[PDB]
């Protein structure tokens, strides 16, 4: 199948910002979030849709129910304007959301 | 074997009836 | 472990292309081999994955019939190999650490540098 | 000498099948039969379903008198079902279930009625392995009939296995799940998984040389004088009153087969001893010297001055000294 | 230091229910199943019925996997047995049984059979617990999650039980009745009676 | 055990008695407490059974709806209550330890001394 994701997502630098990707019964399915800056190779930010992996900080939340993961930064700072990308398994390959590039204004 | 007769009292419900 | 891959591939279309990706520090038998493309400038595209162990492998429905992964257990390396290059196959080329035999819920946690393919 | 056997935590994961066949009387219900069966997990199940999510599946499919089996909880649709935790016990390990009811067939009058349950049972087990470290049990009673330090890497493919290699499987970068707290630990491990007839057990795997050792330090000796009479040593502790006596040649560490753990703690304790009592007014003297002791007793021997391959078998008794 | 662990006698009580399935050949049969179960006898028939009279019912009325199970001695009417002593071995300690043989079928050709037998069967057994004597354990190697010590006397009501309350009943001006001599003893005792799932204990 | 009854009752007719008795020496629930009454000259008739740790109670066809039992285990007392008295229910009452929760079959070993109500 395939999993939609928002073209783009602006966020004031105080305010908090919310990435969603959606498919149909994504929430039977493990959802991870990649987050690539330009130029460099995809870095995982969260696992297993509430997990994060060692080193990286607690502004970064997930969840995941029903039709929609949801992929949550709280107190949104200059550093975090990249590409995100969630991940499923689904039949025999990993389908790749289309990236929601996350602008700092 | 205490460990193992402790089977029944910890994953399951033994006093309870079910009638219909 | 640390996944290490070969330099840019410059080659005319038509051609046939082997990237390798060598492990550091474990045996290298006992994860999987993700392979996963990213073009200039657009989204993630996977290619297929591969297990060291067995040999076994699975490809992408628009990869079928022109990818092919092999693996060489002495040297701790693995090659994906695209036969019959196009204009639209110029990308960046990366192996990971991810979902197949181990599990198809894994998560890609180490990356390599990624191989610029162009065509 | 060393007899405790080497102890490593494990988890089994398994489902309890369970038919009962029930005839329905005129007042009156009874059992013509229960067929309790225990089945393994799959790795599909223990990696994507009980690790990834905390549930586990509504069905159990195994393969038992070589046959490949199917059975549904309730005789149901399969579902996911959450794992949750057993009722307290006393020096109990932790343990999880997904069901506690028994399913028996609705009574239709004069018939023979087949009804089917299915209690997916994850458990904290101790696993204890003795010498040659060929095998290991759990706490259960149950016998895994393979190395605990099998594996992929590290030369641990030359371990003792009985089982076909369809039937083990070693995960790297495995990141465990508290079945109660929910919270995934950071660091990757790697984890053994062996699927027996009867259940699945996984574990973290470990190098077998600096896990085990055939001896075990007993006693610190603070003041050990030493001496040499009639072409042999003798060793004297006034704080335990306890006598040695060794041959004059030393006995190299290398012949005990898996010595790697000698060295190491008679060289903790001896620096340890050195640094709170004698610093101030002895010397060491050379590295620290190895000898046999009749009974089969090994000294790590570390000489003073002032300022100014086998097994070793060891006697129960200390009276000789 | 004390390692000996605290011994006492116990009487356990259960009816062995069996229940056989038989298939009949041209000339043979066959055993396609035999269900074999321990079930505990109930307060009711400890005192009214093996205490009073010597005597036990034919039928098993208990509970296993939820369920109301209900066995019937070769699939007849209820009736009271008498208890009989069982068959001398060495080094072994008293016992009382009321049945002998199993019960199978009536050969009928080309069919599938049932048959039930219930065995009630009266022992006498050592217990042994050991510190801080919060279970005990029997000669039978069945072991019984519940404190010696309990009970509803002088402050015997705190010790450990992991049993319902209803399992658990305390009879004082108990009578013993020896199923040998058929003496019964006069001086009265306290006696506890706990029903485990597969044995009554006393 | 020991059983102790209260004193003797006089009452008129269309009024209500409580009989008390308590037990001493044992905790008082581990036995059922039987009531039984006479009258003068007559046989035995029994009026009810009442089980102190339950509380669970069964009374006779004759005396159903106009006996009550109860109990205050802190005082180990049982209490018997006749409602709607009359001329008849003039008679001695006793209390005993027999049949009930603990067995169907049990004796009245002990007894007690007996209240003498005269209606």
């Known amino acids: ?105 | 074997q205490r460990r193992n007769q402790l089977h029944d009292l910890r994953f399951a419900d033994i006093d309870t009836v079910i009638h219909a | 472990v640390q996944l290490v891959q070969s330099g840019a591939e410059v080659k005319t279309p038509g051609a046939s292309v082997r990237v390798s990706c060598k492990a550091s520090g474990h045996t290298f038998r006992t994860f999987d081999i993700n392979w996963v493309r990213q073009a200039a400038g657009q989204g993630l595209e996977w290619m297929g994955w591969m297990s060291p162990n067995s040999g076994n492998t699975g490809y992408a429905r628009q990869f079928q019939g022109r990818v092919t992964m092999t693996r060489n257990i002495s040297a701790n390396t693995a090659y994906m190999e695209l036969r019959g290059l196009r204009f639209d196959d110029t990308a960046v080329y990366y192996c990971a650490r991810g979902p197949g035999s181990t599990g198809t819920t894994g998560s890609m946690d180490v990356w390599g540098q990624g191989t610029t393919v162009t065509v | 000498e060393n007899i405790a056997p080497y102890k490593f935590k494990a988890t089994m994961y398994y489902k309890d099948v369970t038919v009962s066949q029930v005839w329905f009387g005129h007042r009156y219900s009874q059992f013509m039969g229960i067929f309790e069966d225990r089945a393994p997990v799959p790795f599909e199940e223990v990696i994507d379903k009980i690790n990834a999510k905390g549930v586990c599946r509504s069905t159990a499919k195994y393969v038992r008198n070589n046959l490949e089996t199917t059975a549904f909880h309730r005789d149901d649709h399969e579902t996911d079902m959450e794992l949750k935790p057993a009722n307290a016990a006393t020096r109990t390990s932790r343990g999880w279930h997904t069901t506690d009811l028994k399913y028996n067939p609705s009574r239709v009058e004069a018939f023979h009625r087949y009804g089917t349950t299915v209690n997916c049972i994850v458990e904290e087990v101790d696993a204890r392995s003795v010498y040659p470290y060929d095998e290991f049990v759990l706490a259960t009673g149950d016998f895994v009939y393979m190395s605990p330090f099998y594996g992929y890497r590290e030369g641990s493919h030359t371990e003792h296995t009985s089982y076909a290699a369809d039937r083990f499987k070693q995960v790297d970068g495995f990141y465990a799940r508290d079945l109660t707290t929910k919270a995934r630990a950071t660091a990757p491990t790697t984890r053994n998984l062996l699927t027996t007839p009867k259940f699945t057990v996984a574990w973290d795997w470990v190098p077998k040389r600096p896990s085990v050792c055939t001896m075990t330090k007993w006693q610190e000796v603070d003041e050990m004088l030493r001496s040499e009479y009639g072409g042999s040593f003798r060793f004297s502790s006034d704080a335990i009153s306890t006598t040695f006596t060794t041959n004059l040649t030393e006995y190299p560490l290398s012949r005990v087969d898996l010595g790697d753990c000698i060295g190491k703690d008679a060289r903790d304790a001896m620096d340890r001893i050195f640094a709170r009592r004698y610093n101030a007014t002895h010397i060491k003297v050379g590295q620290p010297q190895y000898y046999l002791a009749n009974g089969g007793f090994l000294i790590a021997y570390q000489p003073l001055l002032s300022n100014t391959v086998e097994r070793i078998k060891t006697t129960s008794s200390i009276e000789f000294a």
């Open chain 1, 1 to 105: 199948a395939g999993l939609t994701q928002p073209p783009s997502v602006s966020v004031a630098p105080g305010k908090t910002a919310r990435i969603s990707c959606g498919g149909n019964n994504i929430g039977s399915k493990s959802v991870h979030w990649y987050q690539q800056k330009p130029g460099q190779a995809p870095v995982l930010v969260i696992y297993y849709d509430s997990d994060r992996p060692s080193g990286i900080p607690e502004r970064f939340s997930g969840s995941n129910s029903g039709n929609t993961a949801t992929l949550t930064i709280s107190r949104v700072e200059a550093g975090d304007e990249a590409d995100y990308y969630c991940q499923v398994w689904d039949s025999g390959s990993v389908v790749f959301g289309g990236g929601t590039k996350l602008t700092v204004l």
